[PDB]
RNA sequence: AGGGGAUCGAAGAUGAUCAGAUACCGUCGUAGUCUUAACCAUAAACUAUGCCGACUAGGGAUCGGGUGGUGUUUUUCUUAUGACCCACUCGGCACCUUACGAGAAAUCAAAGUCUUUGGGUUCUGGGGGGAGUAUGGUCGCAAGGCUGAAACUUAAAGGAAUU
């Protein structure tokens, strides 16, 4: 029976976006925050919104969630992103020099007019 | 596509194209100098025979006819003219 | 208008295809407008297998399958839900579902 | 393409074909068979004088309903019998 | 007043684009109708017709009104707008806007000898929409518009003085005819005529010269 | 009425007509 | 049967132009066709064209600038009688300023303007604009 | 023309080879592609890498010519490229679109994701077809990372590539970024191999 | 086009596609202008100076736009043997 | 008109079902179904797309042939065929995706290269009914076929799509 409406969920999302710092975990505090910030007309509606926010918060502390933005999450993502392998995947060190190429590839390289450390096979069907 | 030199195309492409459909029509067939394993005589056999061509001196049958290119008689050795 | 570009038949290069009779009602239908469902049923029903096995002399026995191709005149097929009415956009799919 | 012949010496075919086709055009057919003279109560003429046989009220076709006030006339020129509508509200009692 | 979405609109507001000519040249998409208003102050709006357009429901039938509007001055600019709404006035208004948005240029030309100021079209141009094919033919001076009243009005709006027409198909469905006419008019530019042979500069677009004036910061 | 049936009817009529003609002859 | 060669050539050219190609391969090739091409070249509707020798009929490679918006033969070569040229022009050409009706006269193959200048007429061939 | 520094120098070529840009053309082949150089006896066609490099350079030259950094839109719907796109955006000026495109983005001046680009770069025509289509409606040029299989409709400048990829797309993106930067003058020299890694682009699934 | 008193009429002269020579129309919302920047020494890409190419919508729609662009480039020397004349 | 006549079966019988049911369903069942000599000349004899020719756009299939593969297998040692495999190529039955072209649209690689109208040709149509009727020919043993009207009548008959 209990499924939340647009006017609850959307509002909750907006709240989360605005105020992820200072909108934290437990219900009563969240409710109070809602009362302070949002201009909610009814009490019941406000309560519902608060509940939804709490739920969202709970969900958050287990991984990121779609549609929900907030400025800390973005920062975290950015931080995560800036990772480089020291060796590199295109280093050729894993192949122990002489990058594994085909005959055709070798020919192409030759035709370009370039000197490269090459290792040549054949490959057939 | 759009812009091409239709006059002098790539050789490979021309080769790929059907005889007739090339820039100027030319045969894909050729003539052969056929050496029979026995006697020292050279006969000029067309690659797409139709007739069972024998050496002019001795009856040996150098080529047998097929659909397109004719088949040579194993003991025989050819050289493209 | 043309409901089908195939005309619901599958012949084109032919001219006359010999008719097969319907397996359900004997409505003579061309061998291409025919709806051919090839039924490989097991000769013994799935629930009655165990009993048969128990009965049988020579344990580890093959138990054969019965084979027949069935030809349904299209109306019959429609009735018996072998074929269903599809949307204009998805009539086009010639590949079997499974 | 195009169904017709085009060649500079076709002419005759174009003519004859056109002539043949013309007969499917109804007015032309009427003109040529002369159905204005042979059939039709007026002998291909704009007007005709006749003698009034009797006055007949005719019931109109559908959507409408009203007795129309027509007159059965026998024409002087040939003797053919025709129905003729008498226009305007009174007018039927001008005929006899 | 007005506040513009789209860079072009902003540019127009600024005053960085002086005439619609530039827009026409660089095929820039006009998506705000106010631009047209700004650049062409002298647009007369002709409502061609209003017709009922119906949809069967379980209860009665929904009737909507189709407004067909032609827009233009007399200097080679015409727009054509079709709009359906339930209110008639509203429909008309929307149609006007649509027409404005559409607005196209015309290649006005001479019949024979370029004595002074072009009167006709430069080339025999056709336009086809639905079944209606509208052929427009360059007429000699002082022969007027020779057209079905609908097309004639459009021609007048465009600023063509003398033109022959050959509308064929089911011209009675007026909207289609109008569309065809519009298409034909459009076609006048896009015909490669010997007095257009020679290659020109390729100017940088007003969207690129004033890239900084574009976008609200 | 189906066209085929109409045709059939016509044919039937024509047979009778033919018979009549024959009789007359 | 290839009833008209010139017509075929013209159609091919048209097809090439419409699809935006910069070169055509005309396949049977004649005197008449060549003459027609030359007229176009003179009027600047076409680039350099060259005749491949097959030792049989021929083959023409034509470069298209893009200016030519329609060729077109008028097929049953009607005998045009000097005062009749005007009517043809009115019919076939898109304007009164430009475009050419190509007509074979005993003075040679030329555009209508040239014919007028020379005061000759003959059978019609095609048109270009 | 380019003054000799813009030749395919060995290191770059090596990198490309490692990525396997040259490899993934697939057996099936679009007729609008003469970027082919031989066909490996197995069936997989080999892309001419010099040509690809040249194309990339050309693209960069275009990108540089756009006066305002934000007016360039980089798009990817396919996951193997989203990260790369983001990286490119970060490095260049560039507005990114990752994942869902949202139709009526270039058209529809009411949308919140409404962009007015003057150049669009795409990872694939095949998968980000919608974006390409939209571009058509509003006169905006499309640089696309086509392999020898993807359709060339509305693609103005194609970079012959690998779209099976994983590494390759990312690498290409990185290269594009780098060249653009060089053109700008943000990287003062052309000889110096740039501080950051090609690996900084790429793509990694949730693993931590 | 041209009036008898010398001076031009013709409200604007239209752009022609650099690939086909075919005229680009006013509501040709498919056509494009490619700007390719003039390069200098140390790369550096000269500010506010470029080679421009107009492409009609039609070619783009067809697909042979890219090829055309390449061709255009390799006659102003912006590319070095990418497009070959003999295919 | 002979021969054959197993099955299936216009007519017929005949049992049900229905208000009726010499209709559907059931059971029989002459003619026919098969054939030999004649005749008949029509079918939604349909791709409802006349034939010949040129050109425009990709893509795989597939059948017939032919080329090139130190390609795979066969094995009686090289084999040599054959069968595959790949690539190309003419001819065919089709099909898939786009149309930048067509079209009233459904749809169409032709139904495209048509108001930017002309490659060559044969046939057919000119609102719906009356009517494929009347009549006159002619061909048929006959059934019928080919040919084919008009008077009069009528504001619609139709096509493709829509909610
Ligand atoms: Mg139906
Ligand atoms: Mg056959
Ligand atoms: Mg049949
Ligand atoms: Mg009975
Ligand atoms: Mg009974
Ligand atoms: Mg029965
Ligand atoms: Mg018939
Ligand atoms: Mg028929
Ligand atoms: Mg009739
Ligand atoms: Mg219907
Ligand atoms: Zn010997
Ligand atoms: Zn059945």
C-beta of residue E103 within 8 angstroms of C-beta of residue E118? no
Domains and CATH numbers, chain B: 1-81 (2.20.25.100)
Report CA-CA distances (Å) from G4 to A44, D3, E80: 89, 18, 45
G128 vs G105: CA distance, rounded Å = 17
C49 vs C43: CA distance, rounded Å = 10
I16 vs I22: CA distance, rounded Å = 5
Residue E136 maps to a domain = yes
Closest-approach nucleotide to residue F10, Cα vs C1': J133
Chain E CA closest to residue G69: E192
Is C44 buried (19+), middle (13-18) or exposed (0-12) by CB count in 10 A? middle
Last residue of a domain, one of E89, E105, E121: E105
Report CA-CA distances (Å) from B30 to B15, B49, E160: 15, 11, 71
Closest-approach nucleotide to residue H41, Cα vs C1': J86
Pairing verdict, β G59-63 and G23-26: antiparallel
Domain G69-129 has CATH 3.30.450.20: no
Q: DSSP secondary structure string, H19-59?
A: HTTTT---SS--TT---EEEE-TTS-EEE-HHHHHHHHHHH
C-beta of residue E78 within 8 angstroms of C-beta of residue E182? yes
Task: Please indicate whether, in this complex, the C-beta atoms of D6 and G77 are within 8 angstroms of each other.
Answer: no
Nearest CA to H194 out of H162, H171, H166 is that of H171
F17 vs F15: CA distance, rounded Å = 5
* Number of separate domains in chain E: 2
G42 vs E48: CA distance, rounded Å = 48
φ, ψ at A82 (rounded to 5°): -70, 65
The residues facing E125 across adjacent strands are E136
The residues facing G73 across adjacent strands are G126
C-beta of residue E18 within 8 angstroms of C-beta of residue E129? no
Pairing verdict, β B77-80 and B31-35: antiparallel
Owner of token pair 């021929």:
G58
Same-domain status, E75 and E164 = no
Same-domain status, E158 and E85 = no
Length reported for chain G: 129
Write down the experimental method used for this entry: cryo-EM
The residues facing B80 across adjacent strands are B32
Same-domain status, E99 and E116 = no
CATH architecture of G1-68: 2-Layer Sandwich (3.30)
Nearest CA to G116 out of G68, G70, G75, G84 is that of G84
Is I13 buried (19+), middle (13-18) or exposed (0-12) by CB count in 10 A? middle
A119 vs H111: CA distance, rounded Å = 54
Same-domain status, E124 and E86 = no
D94 vs D92: CA distance, rounded Å = 5
Is E134 buried (19+), middle (13-18) or exposed (0-12) by CB count in 10 A? buried
**E strands, chain H, in order:** 36-39, 45-47, 72-76, 95-98, 119-122, 142-144
- Tokens standing for residue A5: 């409406």
Task: Resolution in Å, one decimal, please.
Answer: 3.5
φ, ψ at H65 (rounded to 5°): -60, -25
* Residue E128 structural domain: 106-199
Helix (H) or strand (E) holding E22: helix E20-25
Helix (H) or strand (E) holding G101: strand G100-105
Task: Please indicate whether, in this complex, the C-beta atoms of G52 and B3 are within 8 angstroms of each other.
Answer: no
Alpha helix positions (H), chain A: 6-19, 27-37, 43-60, 71-81, 103-112
Q: Write the residue in H17, H38, H50 that is nearest to A107 by C-beta.
A: H38
H122 vs H125: CA distance, rounded Å = 7
Domains and CATH numbers, chain I: 1-87 (3.30.1230.20)
Q: Straight-line distance from CA G2 to C1' J89, in Å?
A: 25
**Domain-by-domain residue ranges, chain C?**
1-98
Length reported for chain B: 81
**Domain-by-domain residue ranges, chain H?**
12-208
**C32 Cα: distance to centroid of ligand 3 (angstroms):** 14
Strand J positions within 7 A of protein Cβ atoms = 47-60, 65-68, 71, 81, 85-90, 92-97, 100-101, 103-108, 111-127, 132-135, 143-144, 150-152, 155, 159-163
Report CA-CA distances (Å) from G55 to B24, B26, G3, G52, H18: 9, 11, 21, 9, 54
Owner of token pair 């509305």:
H154
Same-domain status, E7 and E85 = yes
Same-domain status, E183 and E150 = yes
Task: Please indicate whether, in this complex, the C-beta atoms of I22 and E107 are within 8 angstroms of each other.
Answer: no
Q: How far apart are the first and last CA of chain D?
A: 67
**Going by C-beta distance under 8 Å and a sequence separation of 6 or more, which residues neighbour residue G29?**
G5, G9, G51, G57, G58, G59, G60
The residues facing I16 across adjacent strands are I23
CATH architecture of H12-208: 3-Layer(aba) Sandwich (3.40)
φ, ψ at C8 (rounded to 5°): 75, 10
Radius of gyration of chain D (CA): 23
- Tokens standing for residue E184: 């034909």
E8 vs E11: CA distance, rounded Å = 5
Could you tell me which CATH class the domain C1-98 is placed in? alpha beta
Look up the CATH number of the domain holding residue E123. Answer: 3.30.230.10
E85 vs E174: CA distance, rounded Å = 19
**Going by C-beta distance under 8 Å and a sequence separation of 6 or more, which residues neighbour residue I13?**
E196, E200
A23 vs I1: CA distance, rounded Å = 71
Nearest CA to E151 out of E125, E120, E184 is that of E184
Q: Straight-line distance from CA B47 to C1' J78, in Å?
A: 25
Helix orientation angle between E174-187 and E149-158, rounded to the nearest 10 degrees: 30
Nearest CA to E84 out of E175, E158, E152, E185 is that of E175
A70 vs A44: CA distance, rounded Å = 26
Same-domain status, E60 and E110 = no
Helix (H) or strand (E) holding E125: strand E125-129
Nearest CA to E10 out of H109, H135, I52 is that of H109
Q: Straight-line distance from CA D40 to C1' J153, in Å?
A: 14
C-beta of residue I16 within 8 angstroms of C-beta of residue E14? no
G110 vs G116: CA distance, rounded Å = 10
H117 vs H138: CA distance, rounded Å = 9
Q: Write the residue in G20, G52, G61 that is nearest to B24 by C-beta.
A: G52
E61 vs E67: CA distance, rounded Å = 19
Chain E CA closest to residue H119: E208
- Tokens standing for residue I59: 């070619």
Last residue of a domain, one of E63, E85, E105: E105
Look up the CATH number of the domain holding residue E88. Answer: 3.30.160.20
C-beta of residue H154 within 8 angstroms of C-beta of residue I65? yes
H97 vs H112: CA distance, rounded Å = 13
How far does the CA of residue G58 sit from the closest CA of chain B (Å)? 9
H154 vs H125: CA distance, rounded Å = 9
Is G33 buried (19+), middle (13-18) or exposed (0-12) by CB count in 10 A? buried
């Amino acid at each position: 029976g209990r499924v939340r409406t647009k006017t609850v969920k959307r509002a909750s999302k907006a709240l989360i976006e605005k105020y992820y710092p200072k909108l934290t975990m437990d219900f009563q505090t969240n409710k109070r925050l809602c009362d302070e910030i949002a201009t909610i007309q009814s009490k019941r509606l406000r309560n519902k919104i608060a509940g939804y926010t709490t739920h969202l918060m709970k969900r958050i502390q287990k991984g990121p969630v779609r549609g929900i933005s907030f400025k800390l999450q973005e920062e975290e993502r950015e931080r995560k992103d800036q990772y480089v392998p020291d060796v590199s995947a295109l280093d050729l060190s894993h192949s122990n020099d002489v990058l594994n190429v085909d005959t055709q590839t070798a020919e192409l390289v030759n035709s370009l007019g370039l000197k490269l450390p090459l290792s040549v096979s054949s490959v057939s069907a | 596509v759009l812009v091409q030199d239709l006059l002098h195309p790539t050789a490979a492409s021309e080769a790929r194209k059907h005889k007739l459909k090339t820039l100027v029509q030319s045969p894909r067939s050729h003539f052969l100098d056929v050496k029979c394993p026995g006697c020292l005589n050279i006969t000029t056999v067309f690659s797409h025979a139709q007739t069972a061509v024998t050496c002019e001196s001795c009856s040996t049958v150098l080529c047998t006819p097929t659909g397109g290119k004719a088949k040579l008689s194993e003991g025989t050795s050819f050289r493209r003219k | 208008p043309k409901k089908r570009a195939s005309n619901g038949r599958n012949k084109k290069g032919r001219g006359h295809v010999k008719p097969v009779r319907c397996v359900n009602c004997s409505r003579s239908v061309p061998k291409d407008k025919a709806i051919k469902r090839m039924a490989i049923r097991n000769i013994v029903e799935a629930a009655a297998i165990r009993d048969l096995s128990e009965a049988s002399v020579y344990a580890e026995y093959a138990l054969p399958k019965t084979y027949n191709k069935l030809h349904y005149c299209i109306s019959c097929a429609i009735h018996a839900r072998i074929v269903r009415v599809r949307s204009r956009t998805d009539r086009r799919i010639r590949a079997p579902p499974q | 393409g195009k169904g017709k012949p085009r060649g500079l010496n076709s002419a005759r075919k174009l003519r004859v074909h056109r002539r043949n086709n013309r007969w499917a055009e109804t007015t032309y057919k009427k003109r040529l068979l002369g159905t204005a003279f042979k059939s039709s109560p007026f002998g291909g003429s704009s007007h005709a004088k006749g003698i009034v046989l009797e006055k007949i009220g005719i019931e109109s076709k559908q959507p409408n309903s009203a007795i129309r006030k027509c007159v059965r006339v026998q024409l002087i020129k040939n003797g053919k019998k025709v129905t003729a509508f008498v226009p305007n509200d009174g007018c039927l009692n001008f005929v006899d | 007043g007005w506040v513009p979405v789209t860079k072009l609109g902003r540019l127009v507001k600024a005053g960085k684009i002086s005439s619609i000519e530039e827009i026409f040249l660089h095929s820039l998409p006009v998506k705000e109708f106010q631009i047209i208003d700004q650049l062409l102050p002298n647009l007369k709006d002709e409502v061609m017709n209003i017709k009922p357009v119906q949809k069967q429901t379980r209860a009665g039938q929904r009737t909507r009104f189709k407004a067909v509007v032609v827009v233009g001055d007399s200097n080679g600019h015409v727009g054509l707008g079709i709009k359906t709404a339930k209110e008639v006035a509203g429909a008309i208004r929307a149609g006007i806007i649509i027409a404005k948005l559409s607005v196209i240029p015309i290649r006005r030309g001479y019949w024979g000898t370029n004595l002074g100021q072009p009167h006709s079209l430069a080339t025999k141009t056709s336009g086809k929409c639905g079944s209606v094919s509208v052929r427009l033919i360059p007429a000699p001076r002082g022969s007027g518009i020779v057209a079905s009243p609908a097309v004639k009005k459009l021609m007048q709006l465009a600023g063509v003085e003398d033109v022959y027409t050959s509308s064929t198909g089911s011209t009675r469905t007026l909207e289609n005819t109008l569309k065809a006419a519009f298409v034909a008019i459009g076609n006048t530019y896009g015909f490669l005529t010997p007095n257009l042979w020679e290659v020109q500069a390729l100017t940088p677009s007003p969207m690129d010269v004033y890239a900084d004036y574009a976008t609200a910061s | 009425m189906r066209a085929k049936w109409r045709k059939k009817r016509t044919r039937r009529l024509k047979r009778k007509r033919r018979k009549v003609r024959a009789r007359s002859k | 049967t290839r009833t008209s060669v010139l017509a075929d050539a013209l159609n091919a050219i048209n097809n090439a132009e419409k699809t935006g190609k910069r070169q055509v391969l005309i396949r049977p090739s004649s005197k008449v066709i060549i003459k027609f091409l030359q007229v176009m070249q003179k009027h600047g509707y076409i680039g350099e064209f060259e005749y491949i020798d097959d030792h049989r009929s021929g083959k023409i490679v034509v470069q298209l600038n893009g200016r030519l918006n329609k060729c077109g033969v008028i097929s049953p070569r009607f005998n045009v009688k000097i005062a009749d040229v005007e009517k043809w022009t009115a019919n076939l050409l898109p304007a009164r300023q430009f475009g050419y009706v190509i007509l074979t006269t005993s003075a040679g193959i030329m555009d209508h303007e040239e014919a007028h200048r020379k005061h000759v007429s003959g059978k019609i061939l095609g048109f270009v604009y | 023309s380019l003054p000799s520094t813009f030749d395919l120098t060995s290191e770059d070529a090596q990198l490309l080879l490692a990525a396997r840009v040259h490899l993934g053309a697939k057996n099936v082949q679009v007729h609008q592609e003469p970027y082919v150089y031989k066909a490996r006896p197995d069936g997989v066609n080999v892309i001419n890498v010099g040509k690809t490099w040249e194309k990339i350079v050309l693209a960069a030259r275009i990108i540089a010519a756009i006066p305002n950094p934000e007016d360039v839109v980089a798009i990817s719907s396919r996951t193997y490229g989203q990260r790369a796109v983001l990286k490119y955006a970060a490095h260049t000026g560039a507005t990114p679109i990752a994942g869902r495109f949202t139709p009526g983005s270039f058209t529809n001046y009411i949308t919140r994701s409404f962009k007015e680009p003057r150049l669009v770069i795409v990872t694939d025509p095949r998968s980000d077809a919608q974006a390409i289509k939209e571009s058509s409606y509003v006169n905006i040029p499309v640089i696309a990372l086509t392999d020898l299989d993807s359709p060339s409709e509305y693609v103005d400048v194609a970079i012959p590539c690998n779209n099976r990829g994983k590494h390759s797309i990312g690498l290409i993106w990185y290269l594009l970024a780098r060249e653009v930067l060089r053109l700008r003058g943000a990287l003062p020299d052309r000889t110096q191999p740039w501080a950051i890694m090609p690996d900084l682009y790429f793509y990694r699934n949730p693993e931590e | 086009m041209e009036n008898d008193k010398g001076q031009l009429v013709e409200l604007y002269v239209p752009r022609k596609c650099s690939a086909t020579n075919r005229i680009i129309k006013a509501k040709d919302h498919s056509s494009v202008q490619i700007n390719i920047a003039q390069v200098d020494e140390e790369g550096r890409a000269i500010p506010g100076e470029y080679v421009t190419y107009a492409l009609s919508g039609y070619i783009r729609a067809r697909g042979e736009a890219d090829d055309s662009l390449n061709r255009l480039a390799q006659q102003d020397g912006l590319l070095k043997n990418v497009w070959s004349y003999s295919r």
